[PDB]
Design a protein around this ligand. Sequence first.
Ligand SMILES: Clc1ccc2nc(N3CCCCC3)c(-c3nnn[nH]3)c(-c3ccccc3)c2c1
Length: 134
Amino acid sequence: ATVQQLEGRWRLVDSKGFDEYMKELGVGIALRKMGAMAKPDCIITCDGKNLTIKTESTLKTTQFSCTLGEKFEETTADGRKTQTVCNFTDGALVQHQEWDGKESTITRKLKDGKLVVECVMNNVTCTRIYEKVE
Ligand SMILES: Clc1ccc2nc(N3CCCCC3)c(-c3nnn[nH]3)c(-c3ccccc3)c2c1
């Protein structure tokens, strides 16, 4: 498994726990309704250790870029400014966010040809499945 195997455009096809995760993050009702009903594509590109992830939907589009292993300021979809680091470890892309004494982890992995995205904060979890799109 390598980080390049995650590259491409991926379309959300299933979600569990996302509203509960947004509630744990402190996200207000307007953004939570958006996130409940948006059907995003995620576009992952990686050039060596340079990673970009763009999330596109009719309701909201976000994008960040980073160098694997390097701490950077990420503005999240809900507007947090976190100290984030992304690494490819044990066959998964692991994204660690820290802000205001809080922390959340997001993992992305390839399983059966689908992109499986899992998030957690304070044991509140989400699982989102994306299928590869042309
Ligand atoms: Cl308001 C809000 C708050 C938190 C969010 N966390 C997200 N992530 C979950 C998957 C791992 C990366 C983080 C995503 C998201 N990113 N890619 N897919 N969903 C969204 C989001 C963005 C645009 C359209 C629909 C949903 C989002 C929106």
